[PDB]
Symmetry: D2
Subunit: 237 residues, 4 copies
Amino acid sequence: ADTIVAVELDTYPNTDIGDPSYPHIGIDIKSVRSKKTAKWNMQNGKVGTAHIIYNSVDKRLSAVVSYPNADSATVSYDVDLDNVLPEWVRVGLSASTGLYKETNTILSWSFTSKLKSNSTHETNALHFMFNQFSKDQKDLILQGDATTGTDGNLELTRVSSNGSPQGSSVGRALFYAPVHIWESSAVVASFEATFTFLIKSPDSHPADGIAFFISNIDSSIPSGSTGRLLGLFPDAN
Amino acid sequence: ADTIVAVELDTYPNTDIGDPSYPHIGIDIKSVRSKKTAKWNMQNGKVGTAHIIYNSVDKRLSAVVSYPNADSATVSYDVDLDNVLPEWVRVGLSASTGLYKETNTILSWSFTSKLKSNSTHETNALHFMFNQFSKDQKDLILQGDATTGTDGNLELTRVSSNGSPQGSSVGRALFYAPVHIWESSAVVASFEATFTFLIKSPDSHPADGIAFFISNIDSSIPSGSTGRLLGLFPDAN
Amino acid sequence: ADTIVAVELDTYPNTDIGDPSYPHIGIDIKSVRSKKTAKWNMQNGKVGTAHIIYNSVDKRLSAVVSYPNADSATVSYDVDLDNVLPEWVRVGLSASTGLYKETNTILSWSFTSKLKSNSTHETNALHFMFNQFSKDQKDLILQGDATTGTDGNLELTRVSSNGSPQGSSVGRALFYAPVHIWESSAVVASFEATFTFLIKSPDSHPADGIAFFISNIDSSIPSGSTGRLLGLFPDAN
Amino acid sequence: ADTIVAVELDTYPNTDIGDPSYPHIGIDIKSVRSKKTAKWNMQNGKVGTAHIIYNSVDKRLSAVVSYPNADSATVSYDVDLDNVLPEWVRVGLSASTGLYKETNTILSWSFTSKLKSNSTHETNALHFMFNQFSKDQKDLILQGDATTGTDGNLELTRVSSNGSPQGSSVGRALFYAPVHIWESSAVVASFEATFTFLIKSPDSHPADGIAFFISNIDSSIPSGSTGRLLGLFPDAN
Ligand SMILES: CO[C@H]1O[C@H](CO[C@H]2O[C@H](CO)[C@@H](O)[C@H](O)[C@@H]2O)[C@@H](O)[C@H](O[C@H]2O[C@H](CO)[C@@H](O)[C@H](O)[C@@H]2O)[C@@H]1CCO
Ligand SMILES: CO[C@H]1O[C@H](CO[C@H]2O[C@H](CO)[C@@H](O)[C@H](O)[C@@H]2O)[C@@H](O)[C@H](O[C@H]2O[C@H](CO)[C@@H](O)[C@H](O)[C@@H]2O)[C@@H]1CCO
Ligand SMILES: CO[C@H]1O[C@H](CO[C@H]2O[C@H](CO)[C@@H](O)[C@H](O)[C@@H]2O)[C@@H](O)[C@H](O[C@H]2O[C@H](CO)[C@@H](O)[C@H](O)[C@@H]2O)[C@@H]1CCO
Ligand SMILES: CO[C@H]1O[C@H](CO[C@H]2O[C@H](CO)[C@@H](O)[C@H](O)[C@@H]2O)[C@@H](O)[C@H](O[C@H]2O[C@H](CO)[C@@H](O)[C@H](O)[C@@H]2O)[C@@H]1CCO
Ligand SMILES: [Ca+2]
Ligand SMILES: [Ca+2]
Ligand SMILES: [Ca+2]
Ligand SMILES: [Ca+2]
Ligand SMILES: [Mn+2]
Ligand SMILES: [Mn+2]
Ligand SMILES: [Mn+2]
Ligand SMILES: [Mn+2]
């Protein structure tokens, strides 16, 4: 299977698999059962912002999710990515729905990664910023039900003609170029990601969530990973 | 077949195909016969720097090549890239040798492209910086004789284990991710590229040169494009 | 006597001193009488964007002003800044009103300057971005009627608590740190500036305009430089 | 007195005031007696690099110092800068010598600070990079014995005409523009600083060290702060 490290914006509580009894943000390391979570007050129909950061000095993965004029939610977890992910990876966004649904619209997404060599202290870096998505975005790899173009946004999951989100949907978008996330021969390594989203649902219980993830370069949506699996894992192990 | 826009650092004069009688830098628009050139005092064995810039406001492609403590060579050409290249392209470096040779070593390469929407005025951007190249640089597509790893450098053309250049060689390196170079519905579009090189040759007359180029995404080294064709064109038309 | 280089967004035509008979954007080099102008379709009440760029390779100062979903206006002028401005300067925004008025509200302002050494080929750079202004913005030098705080915006000229513009007003805002705009020992040098503005007026003829300028570090609003002088020049010579 | 937050590269152990019995790097919060330290293998005559980082999500100040092809030293400390420093500050570098001496040469220095609004989620930023220091660097405030120009470097402490470092010297360099380090109404605040240095001494025990610091905007060298006080504190409390 693929190797996944992700930050999830979980909108639906699946208490039988470790989720707390309320929407939450979490840090997932090779498992959908978050290693750490924090309560999240998701606002249906409002544009939110998620910021993820990691640096090899502290080797701590943190994330903060918030809405304009509102208290934010934050979660952090100490993890050595050199022992979890392959040297080269691809980064992306994923989302899913199951019995319950919601729109999983991405309005913007930026990412920056830097690697400083230990031998010459020279830096290698990558940065990309999307504030508008095109109908034919060649620098993005769309998987599953993900689509771009409508209103210049990226719709990770299926949305019908009348604008209603569909259930049992899963979709992801990965940046085309592989990213050198870590190198034993580097003095300092770090990355940051930011994305704005719009989660809207008709029912009282929206599902299932959105996640920023990092994985092996040839990663694909695990078959049947709709619902609680967030298009990231093959099972709930 | 391929669509090419490039800035050439032509070290060998091929006066039979439009080249001036001296090393020069030039702007090539869909043809190896530069639309504009400038005399270049290449210094065999010294590390040089090349800077290329373009913006849709002025629709002018300019380049400056220089060596520390020496007069620089500059060349500019008016050109609307919207009417020359396809919307999406790939950027890279190319180099070749023929009867005569030279090392076509790249010590660093950076690139930045920005596109501003005409509707929301928001910007999309891409930036990458290579100050060290590794044996397995996954975010680079290597073609022909290009290799990476030795001394953390990118050798565009064939060189022995000691550093001796070989003739009849051609190689290119392209950034993995496609770049959205121009968009009709964009207020301003621009890009810049910078690369440091080391051209060293044992013979009196080195050849054939190095070039920074922009092409269709599926661009490949044209058959037989060694020597004077710099691995960019199929013929000298 | 200050040394001024500026890009003006001239809303009121003063034909007695060289202005064309319509709103326009122009490049002013040590004189309010623009060296080059372009027709500008100012839209009263709407937020617009102005982008200014200059690079030592081409030695050309260009600017583009536009409003979402509308054609833009562009003006360019070839000028060697090392022969016009002192090596060190301060950058800022200025605006004024006279018999007629308008709000000269700045919603955001960014600037980036780079100087690359000719001996070591290394670069010095400065970048600042203001997407929100505070009541006490310590990194900004406010002159005349300029104030910060109201709705997180920078009001260059006097406005009432409700938003009504006042006549006979002049104000400027300069970045606190001096900028090394040019250095003889530099291979390449360049800068870019961007700002969003909101010009609204109750009368049929708004005045007088907004300008992005570069001046000697100790520059101040010339005595009586309200109205047509845009707070930049002592007279209309 | 001033309010100081700093990262010290302490080359001389003063065990009577809390220093460990070996050169070290430390985090100083309003006191020369570091809140946290780490063993540092300083290499006399070699160019080293220091990287400092801080972010409001983890509220952790970290620093890493190293030399090419050698293990690095790292120190991290939990601290909420919002409760230690004033809203606006100035950043700089300081160094000193006492009975024993060393050259406290700075070859490069960069800094970046970002503040994201909680009501608009828009960010304000500042970035500066010095790879070359000029004899008259107007964007730098030099204090005490600090000088610039010699070989394009910044000499924090006095060096004789023969190139020998002098004892009982103290000097600092602060960036001209004040920096908005924290803002209650900001969702995320962060900053990073990097600088290369060259510490050389004929002595068997060089002294006293270099430090990157953040202080009140009107900060000046405390009288008599040579030696173990690193030009940052008035006493060793
Ligand atoms: C029949 O009940 C079980 O299945 C429904 C529907 O599950 C699908 O839809 C949800 C929401 O989109 C996805 O998260 C799932 O992966 C499926 O795709 C669940 O809603 C039920 O959950 C409720 O009951 C559980 C058992 O007590 C509890 O743990 C949950 O937190 C929730 O209260 C239930 C899921 C069984 O795994
Ligand atoms: C026999 O002479 C012709 O061929 C040689 C060798 O050409 C190959 O090597 C060069 C240098 O690496 C490459 O640029 C070519 O593409 C081939 O790979 C050339 O050196 C000769 O050029 C000289 O003579 C020309 C006159 O015929 C003159 O125009 C050139 O400027 C140069 O002085 C020559 C090339 C014929 O096309
Ligand atoms: C009495 O007329 C002259 O003065 C008025 C008022 O000038 C003040 O207000 C304007 C607009 O805010 C500022 O630009 C000035 O600097 C003063 O502060 C001007 O409006 C008049 O201009 C008109 O008439 C001119 C002469 O025919 C003509 O050239 C202008 O284009 C305009 O049509 C006039 C200005 C004399 O200098
Ligand atoms: C007489 O000894 C005391 O003073 C000398 C000189 O101090 C000055 O120079 C040093 C080095 O440049 C600076 O750090 C000081 O601030 C003064 O400017 C010190 O070298 C002595 O230190 C040694 O002895 C101490 C007492 O046992 C010990 O704690 C130190 O670690 C060191 O071994 C000494 C300092 C008294 O405070
Ligand atoms: Ca869940
Ligand atoms: Ca040639
Ligand atoms: Ca006018
Ligand atoms: Ca000490
Ligand atoms: Mn969960
Ligand atoms: Mn040529
Ligand atoms: Mn005018
Ligand atoms: Mn100490």
